[PDB]
Short mmCIF file of C-alpha atoms (C1' of nucleotides) and ligand atoms in Angstrom, two decimals:
data_model
loop_
_atom_site.label_atom_id
_atom_site.label_comp_id
_atom_site.label_asym_id
_atom_site.label_seq_id
_atom_site.Cartn_x
_atom_site.Cartn_y
_atom_site.Cartn_z
CA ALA A 1 80.30 95.45 120.72
CA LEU A 2 81.35 95.70 124.34
CA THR A 3 79.75 92.53 125.91
CA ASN A 4 81.26 89.02 125.47
CA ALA A 5 77.74 87.86 124.48
CA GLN A 6 77.50 90.55 121.79
CA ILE A 7 80.96 89.68 120.44
CA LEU A 8 80.05 85.99 120.25
CA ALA A 9 76.88 86.97 118.40
CA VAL A 10 78.99 88.95 115.90
CA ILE A 11 81.35 86.03 115.33
CA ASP A 12 78.39 83.62 114.91
CA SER A 13 76.57 85.88 112.36
CA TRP A 14 79.84 86.34 110.43
CA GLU A 15 80.51 82.58 110.31
CA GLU A 16 76.95 81.84 109.15
CA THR A 17 77.19 84.42 106.31
CA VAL A 18 80.74 83.44 105.21
CA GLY A 19 79.65 79.78 105.45
CA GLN A 20 77.30 80.47 102.47
CA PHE A 21 80.11 82.00 100.33
CA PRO A 22 81.04 79.75 97.36
CA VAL A 23 83.49 77.01 98.34
CA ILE A 24 86.34 76.98 95.84
CA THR A 25 88.82 74.13 95.82
CA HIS A 26 92.48 75.08 95.40
CA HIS A 27 95.25 72.53 94.96
CA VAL A 28 98.43 73.83 96.53
CA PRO A 29 102.12 73.02 96.94
CA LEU A 30 102.95 71.73 100.41
CA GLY A 31 106.72 71.58 100.01
CA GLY A 32 108.69 68.38 99.67
CA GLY A 33 107.20 67.76 96.24
CA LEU A 34 103.75 67.10 97.73
CA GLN A 35 100.39 68.69 96.95
CA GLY A 36 97.33 69.29 99.09
CA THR A 37 93.84 70.68 98.73
CA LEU A 38 92.30 73.70 100.44
CA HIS A 39 88.62 74.73 100.40
CA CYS A 40 88.41 78.52 100.41
CA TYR A 41 85.12 80.30 101.17
CA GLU A 42 85.42 83.19 98.74
CA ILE A 43 83.63 86.50 99.03
CA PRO A 44 81.98 87.46 95.71
CA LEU A 45 83.83 89.62 93.21
CA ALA A 46 81.10 92.27 93.13
CA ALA A 47 78.15 93.44 95.17
CA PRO A 48 76.17 91.96 96.74
CA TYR A 49 78.79 90.25 98.94
CA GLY A 50 76.66 89.04 101.84
CA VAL A 51 74.77 90.44 104.80
CA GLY A 52 77.01 92.81 106.69
CA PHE A 53 79.81 92.97 104.11
CA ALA A 54 81.07 95.81 101.95
CA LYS A 55 84.18 96.42 99.88
CA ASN A 56 86.48 99.24 100.94
CA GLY A 57 89.32 98.38 98.55
CA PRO A 58 90.10 96.19 95.53
CA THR A 59 91.03 93.32 97.93
CA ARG A 60 89.71 94.85 101.20
CA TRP A 61 86.34 94.32 102.89
CA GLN A 62 84.63 95.27 106.14
CA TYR A 63 81.93 93.60 108.24
CA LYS A 64 79.41 95.88 109.98
CA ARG A 65 76.62 95.27 112.47
CA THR A 66 74.20 97.56 114.33
CA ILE A 67 74.38 96.93 118.09
CA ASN A 68 72.77 99.15 120.72
CA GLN A 69 71.55 101.31 117.80
CA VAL A 70 75.25 102.01 116.97
CA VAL A 71 77.15 100.78 113.90
CA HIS A 72 80.22 98.69 114.78
CA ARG A 73 82.60 97.87 111.92
CA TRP A 74 85.65 95.64 111.54
CA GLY A 75 88.06 94.51 108.86
CA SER A 76 86.31 91.54 107.31
CA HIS A 77 88.99 88.99 108.30
CA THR A 78 89.44 90.27 111.88
CA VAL A 79 86.06 89.10 113.17
CA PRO A 80 87.14 85.55 114.22
CA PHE A 81 89.70 87.09 116.59
CA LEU A 82 87.61 89.76 118.37
CA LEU A 83 88.15 88.00 121.73
CA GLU A 84 91.92 87.87 121.27
CA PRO A 85 94.55 90.41 122.28
CA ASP A 86 94.89 92.99 119.53
CA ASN A 87 98.66 93.33 119.95
CA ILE A 88 101.68 91.18 120.65
CA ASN A 89 105.07 92.39 121.87
CA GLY A 90 103.88 95.90 121.05
CA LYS A 91 103.03 95.02 117.45
CA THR A 92 99.55 95.11 115.98
CA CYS A 93 97.88 91.75 115.47
CA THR A 94 96.73 91.18 111.89
CA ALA A 95 94.56 88.68 110.14
CA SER A 96 96.89 86.41 108.19
CA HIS A 97 95.81 84.15 105.33
CA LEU A 98 97.33 80.69 105.49
CA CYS A 99 95.86 80.05 102.03
CA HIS A 100 97.31 83.28 100.60
CA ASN A 101 93.89 83.99 99.01
CA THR A 102 92.59 87.47 99.98
CA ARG A 103 88.95 86.79 99.02
CA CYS A 104 88.85 83.73 101.26
CA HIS A 105 87.13 84.23 104.60
CA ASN A 106 87.36 80.61 105.85
CA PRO A 107 88.47 81.05 109.49
CA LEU A 108 90.20 77.68 109.25
CA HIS A 109 92.54 79.45 106.82
CA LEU A 110 93.21 82.49 109.07
CA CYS A 111 95.50 83.22 111.99
CA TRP A 112 96.14 86.30 114.13
CA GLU A 113 99.75 87.43 114.26
CA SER A 114 102.13 90.32 113.71
CA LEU A 115 102.44 91.78 110.23
CA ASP A 116 106.03 90.49 110.10
CA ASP A 117 104.87 86.90 110.87
CA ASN A 118 102.08 87.33 108.30
CA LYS A 119 104.39 88.55 105.55
CA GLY A 120 107.00 85.90 106.26
CA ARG A 121 104.62 83.08 105.38
CA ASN A 122 104.91 84.17 101.74
CA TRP A 123 108.38 82.56 101.64
CA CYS A 124 107.78 79.55 103.88
CA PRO A 125 108.84 76.17 102.41
CA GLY A 126 105.54 74.75 103.64
CA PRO A 127 104.25 72.05 105.97
CA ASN A 128 106.04 69.27 104.05
CA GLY A 129 109.13 71.29 103.16
CA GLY A 130 110.38 72.53 106.53
CA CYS A 131 107.87 75.02 107.92
CA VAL A 132 108.82 75.95 111.49
CA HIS A 133 105.85 78.22 112.17
CA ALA A 134 104.39 77.21 115.54
CA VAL A 135 100.97 77.78 114.02
CA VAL A 136 101.77 75.69 110.96
CA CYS A 137 101.42 76.82 107.38
CA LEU A 138 98.78 75.17 105.21
CA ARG A 139 100.90 75.48 102.06
CA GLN A 140 104.28 76.48 100.73
CA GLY A 141 104.44 80.26 100.40
CA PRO A 142 103.84 81.51 96.86
CA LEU A 143 107.19 83.33 96.78
CA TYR A 144 109.32 80.44 98.02
CA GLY A 145 112.16 79.59 95.69
CA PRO A 146 115.57 80.58 94.36
CA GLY A 147 114.64 84.13 93.40
CA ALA A 148 115.74 86.04 90.33
CA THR A 149 118.69 88.06 91.59
CA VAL A 150 120.26 90.14 88.81
CA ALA A 151 123.63 90.78 90.45
CA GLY A 152 125.31 89.41 93.55
CA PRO A 153 127.85 90.88 95.94
CA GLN A 154 130.89 92.27 94.17
CA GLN A 155 133.65 94.84 94.41
CA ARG A 156 135.91 96.43 91.81
CA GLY A 157 138.85 97.10 94.16
CA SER A 158 140.36 95.41 97.19
CA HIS A 159 138.91 97.45 100.05
CA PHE A 160 136.29 95.02 101.37
CA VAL A 161 136.02 91.63 103.03
CA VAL A 162 132.89 89.62 103.75
CA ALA B 1 124.60 110.59 79.43
CA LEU B 2 127.42 109.29 81.58
CA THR B 3 129.77 106.98 79.72
CA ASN B 4 130.42 103.53 81.15
CA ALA B 5 133.95 104.80 81.99
CA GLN B 6 132.39 107.67 83.95
CA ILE B 7 130.11 105.20 85.72
CA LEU B 8 133.09 103.04 86.69
CA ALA B 9 134.75 106.16 88.10
CA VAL B 10 131.65 106.81 90.24
CA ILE B 11 131.70 103.22 91.52
CA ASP B 12 135.43 103.52 92.29
CA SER B 13 135.03 106.79 94.21
CA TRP B 14 132.12 105.29 96.16
CA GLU B 15 134.18 102.20 97.04
CA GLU B 16 137.13 104.34 98.13
CA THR B 17 134.92 106.38 100.46
CA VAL B 18 132.87 103.48 101.87
CA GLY B 19 136.07 101.51 102.44
CA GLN B 20 137.02 104.11 105.04
CA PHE B 21 133.78 103.74 107.00
CA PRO B 22 134.14 102.08 110.43
CA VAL B 23 134.40 98.31 110.01
CA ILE B 24 132.30 96.53 112.63
CA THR B 25 132.63 92.80 113.29
CA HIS B 26 129.26 91.12 113.89
CA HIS B 27 128.71 87.52 114.96
CA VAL B 28 125.62 86.16 113.21
CA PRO B 29 123.51 83.01 112.95
CA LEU B 30 124.13 81.01 109.78
CA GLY B 31 121.39 78.43 110.33
CA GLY B 32 121.85 74.87 111.44
CA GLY B 33 122.94 76.06 114.88
CA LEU B 34 126.16 77.51 113.45
CA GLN B 35 127.59 80.99 113.98
CA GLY B 36 129.61 83.08 111.57
CA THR B 37 131.17 86.54 111.28
CA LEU B 38 130.30 89.46 109.01
CA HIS B 39 132.30 92.66 108.63
CA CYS B 40 130.02 95.61 107.98
CA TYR B 41 131.25 98.99 106.72
CA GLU B 42 128.84 101.25 108.57
CA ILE B 43 127.91 104.77 107.55
CA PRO B 44 128.09 107.17 110.54
CA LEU B 45 124.98 107.87 112.60
CA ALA B 46 125.20 111.63 112.01
CA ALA B 47 126.83 114.08 109.64
CA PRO B 48 129.45 114.09 108.30
CA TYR B 49 128.96 110.71 106.65
CA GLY B 50 131.70 110.75 104.02
CA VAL B 51 132.49 112.55 100.78
CA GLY B 52 129.44 112.47 98.52
CA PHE B 53 127.02 111.10 101.12
CA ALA B 54 123.95 112.68 102.64
CA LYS B 55 121.01 111.40 104.64
CA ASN B 56 117.53 111.66 103.11
CA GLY B 57 115.73 109.64 105.78
CA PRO B 58 116.21 107.98 109.16
CA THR B 59 117.88 105.01 107.45
CA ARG B 60 118.10 106.34 103.89
CA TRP B 61 121.14 107.91 102.24
CA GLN B 62 122.15 109.15 98.81
CA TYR B 63 125.44 109.44 96.96
CA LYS B 64 125.98 112.52 94.77
CA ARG B 65 128.65 113.40 92.22
CA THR B 66 128.83 116.37 89.86
CA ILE B 67 130.18 115.54 86.41
CA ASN B 68 130.62 118.17 83.69
CA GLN B 69 128.50 120.56 85.76
CA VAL B 70 125.58 118.11 86.04
CA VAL B 71 124.61 116.85 89.49
CA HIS B 72 123.97 113.09 89.55
CA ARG B 73 122.49 111.36 92.57
CA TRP B 74 121.79 107.75 93.45
CA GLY B 75 120.47 105.81 96.40
CA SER B 76 123.53 105.13 98.51
CA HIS B 77 123.37 101.33 98.19
CA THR B 78 122.57 101.30 94.45
CA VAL B 79 125.98 102.51 93.27
CA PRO B 80 127.66 99.05 93.07
CA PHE B 81 124.99 98.02 90.54
CA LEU B 82 125.06 100.95 88.13
CA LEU B 83 126.39 98.72 85.32
CA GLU B 84 123.65 96.13 85.83
CA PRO B 85 120.14 95.86 84.42
CA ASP B 86 117.72 97.83 86.60
CA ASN B 87 114.67 95.57 86.30
CA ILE B 88 113.91 91.89 85.96
CA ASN B 89 110.63 90.10 85.21
CA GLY B 90 109.01 93.53 84.99
CA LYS B 91 110.03 94.37 88.56
CA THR B 92 112.40 97.13 89.68
CA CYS B 93 115.75 95.98 91.06
CA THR B 94 116.54 97.03 94.63
CA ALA B 95 119.66 96.96 96.74
CA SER B 96 119.23 94.08 99.16
CA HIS B 97 121.28 93.71 102.34
CA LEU B 98 122.54 90.17 102.89
CA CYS B 99 123.75 91.33 106.31
CA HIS B 100 120.36 92.93 107.18
CA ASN B 101 122.22 96.01 108.49
CA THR B 102 120.86 99.12 106.76
CA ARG B 103 123.82 101.34 107.69
CA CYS B 104 126.24 98.88 106.10
CA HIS B 105 127.51 99.85 102.66
CA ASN B 106 129.88 96.92 102.14
CA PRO B 107 129.21 95.89 98.50
CA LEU B 108 130.11 92.30 99.44
CA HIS B 109 126.98 92.43 101.65
CA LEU B 110 124.64 93.64 98.89
CA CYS B 111 122.79 92.10 96.00
CA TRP B 112 120.45 93.52 93.37
CA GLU B 113 117.03 91.93 93.10
CA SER B 114 113.31 92.49 93.21
CA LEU B 115 111.79 93.92 96.37
CA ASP B 116 109.95 90.64 96.98
CA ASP B 117 113.25 88.67 96.80
CA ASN B 118 114.82 91.30 99.07
CA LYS B 119 112.07 91.10 101.70
CA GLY B 120 112.02 87.30 101.64
CA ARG B 121 115.57 87.06 102.88
CA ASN B 122 114.33 88.30 106.28
CA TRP B 123 112.85 84.83 106.93
CA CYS B 124 115.50 82.66 105.24
CA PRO B 125 116.90 79.80 107.35
CA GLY B 126 120.39 80.78 106.19
CA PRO B 127 123.33 79.31 104.27
CA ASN B 128 123.76 76.44 106.76
CA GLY B 129 120.03 75.99 107.47
CA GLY B 130 118.48 75.37 104.07
CA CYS B 131 118.78 78.57 102.02
CA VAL B 132 117.67 78.02 98.42
CA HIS B 133 118.43 81.52 97.16
CA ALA B 134 120.48 81.19 93.98
CA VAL B 135 122.56 84.13 95.21
CA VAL B 136 123.08 82.59 98.63
CA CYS B 137 122.27 84.35 101.89
CA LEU B 138 125.20 85.31 104.10
CA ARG B 139 123.24 84.66 107.28
CA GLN B 140 119.97 83.38 108.66
CA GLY B 141 117.30 86.05 108.31
CA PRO B 142 116.56 88.02 111.47
CA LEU B 143 112.88 87.03 111.42
CA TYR B 144 113.40 83.30 110.86
CA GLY B 145 111.78 81.09 113.46
CA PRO B 146 108.52 79.79 114.91
CA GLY B 147 106.91 83.22 115.14
CA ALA B 148 104.63 84.55 117.84
CA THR B 149 101.17 83.83 116.49
CA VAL B 150 98.51 84.87 118.98
CA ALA B 151 95.61 82.75 117.68
CA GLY B 152 95.43 80.02 115.08
CA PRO B 153 92.70 78.85 112.75
CA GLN B 154 89.45 78.15 114.53
CA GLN B 155 85.69 78.16 114.17
CA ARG B 156 82.87 78.29 116.71
CA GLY B 157 80.35 76.23 114.71
CA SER B 158 80.55 73.61 111.97
CA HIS B 159 80.12 75.79 108.86
CA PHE B 160 83.64 75.19 107.57
CA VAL B 161 86.04 72.52 106.41
CA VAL B 162 89.72 73.13 105.77
"C1'" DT C 1 130.67 121.45 93.33
"C1'" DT C 2 129.53 120.21 97.83
"C1'" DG C 3 127.11 119.39 102.47
"C1'" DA C 4 123.19 119.11 105.27
"C1'" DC C 5 119.09 119.35 105.55
"C1'" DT C 6 113.95 119.31 103.48
"C1'" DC C 7 109.88 116.82 101.13
"C1'" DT C 8 107.16 112.94 99.01
"C1'" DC C 9 106.96 108.14 96.72
"C1'" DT C 10 106.78 102.39 95.97
"C1'" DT C 11 105.33 97.76 97.17
"C1'" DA C 12 102.31 94.18 98.98
"C1'" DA C 13 101.14 92.14 103.13
"C1'" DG C 14 97.66 94.42 106.20
"C1'" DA C 15 93.93 98.75 108.35
"C1'" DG C 16 90.16 102.88 109.80
"C1'" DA C 17 86.47 106.08 108.61
"C1'" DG C 18 82.97 109.16 105.62
"C1'" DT C 19 79.18 109.83 101.91
"C1'" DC C 20 75.06 108.90 100.10
"C1'" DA C 21 70.54 106.19 99.17
"C1'" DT D 1 69.17 99.48 109.33
"C1'" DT D 2 71.50 97.80 105.56
"C1'" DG D 3 74.00 98.32 101.15
"C1'" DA D 4 77.45 100.29 98.03
"C1'" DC D 5 80.29 103.16 97.26
"C1'" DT D 6 84.27 106.94 98.47
"C1'" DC D 7 88.78 108.34 100.77
"C1'" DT D 8 93.27 107.84 103.32
"C1'" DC D 9 96.36 105.09 106.68
"C1'" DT D 10 100.31 101.29 108.59
"C1'" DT D 11 104.52 98.72 108.19
"C1'" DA D 12 109.26 97.73 106.88
"C1'" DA D 13 111.86 96.26 103.13
"C1'" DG D 14 113.12 99.77 99.50
"C1'" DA D 15 113.15 104.94 96.25
"C1'" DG D 16 113.50 110.23 93.62
"C1'" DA D 17 113.91 115.15 93.94
"C1'" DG D 18 114.23 120.47 96.03
"C1'" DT D 19 116.50 124.39 98.70
"C1'" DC D 20 120.20 127.15 100.20
"C1'" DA D 21 124.75 128.81 100.80
MG1 MG E 1 99.50 87.16 104.47
MG1 MG E 2 116.50 93.55 102.76
ZN1 ZN E 3 91.34 80.02 101.96
ZN1 ZN E 4 105.40 78.09 107.65
ZN1 ZN E 5 127.00 94.44 106.23
ZN1 ZN E 6 118.51 82.56 101.62
#
DNA sequence: TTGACTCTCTTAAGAGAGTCA
DNA sequence: TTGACTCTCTTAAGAGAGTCA
């Protein structure tokens, strides 16, 4: 809600509820041939999810609280960042999973950044493979690698140069 | 169905037309602090675009040819790949700009790959900065770098471990 | 046969809001 | 007030198809 006190109360209630979500250990590539371990706090697969939480999409949830007799509702991963600017360079700030695990609500696995920055982590080589993200990745992106390109650049004639 | 000879004729007419597009020299980052040069063959900003070409969206075009009284139409960047498989690993193949310049139709600046592979090139460090794409990038991706993350991982209490 | 427009759709990283009990 | 559902939207890398002369 509007007051700083009320927003802190929202963040604190959220953390306490998510803190009781099952803690699931995931071993992850870090880049550089190394492996690490993340502890994700995973929202349940089906109702009930936890006080204040409801599913609005297969991998989408919202957190809701009643404040001043009014319902206030947020995307379930946005709550840690309610005191942060909601835009950057004219781009919307998004909740971004460093663990690349949608069900996880561990705020130690979340950052707040443009959708482009968010997406780009999918291909990051990782914290031991060359990550240059200023807010560092926790793991190599799941899509990092050589790709599976079917056909490369080519011409039949002689009209083009690189 | 069009014979492979008819398909080659389509590719050849496309190349002949695109080859006459304005050729624009662009200096680009390669990664590793190095700079290179790409020569993009850029479709005009407004009609007329070239024989066979029409705009279906702000940065979308199509190529159309009529053969034996049947109108055939393709996405304007897909024509170089008409003799290639159109999917891989159960994913549709997409035209992917190695120069990251949508108006460019130089086939030496295009490859044919999944949309995920395509997107990921936006963040690639580039051919002199650590690119691991098997079909190598021509330049560092425009979105490579430290990012502009507004807030990193954080908690107010002690409910969480990383 | 051709040009110049029109419309909606896909994907996978993210969102907001309404209907009932 | 709280829970459990429903629906459509945003973005930026890509698509197919219709109308008219
Ligand atoms: Mg993400
Ligand atoms: Mg691309
Ligand atoms: Zn996690
Ligand atoms: Zn990174
Ligand atoms: Zn180009
Ligand atoms: Zn690359």
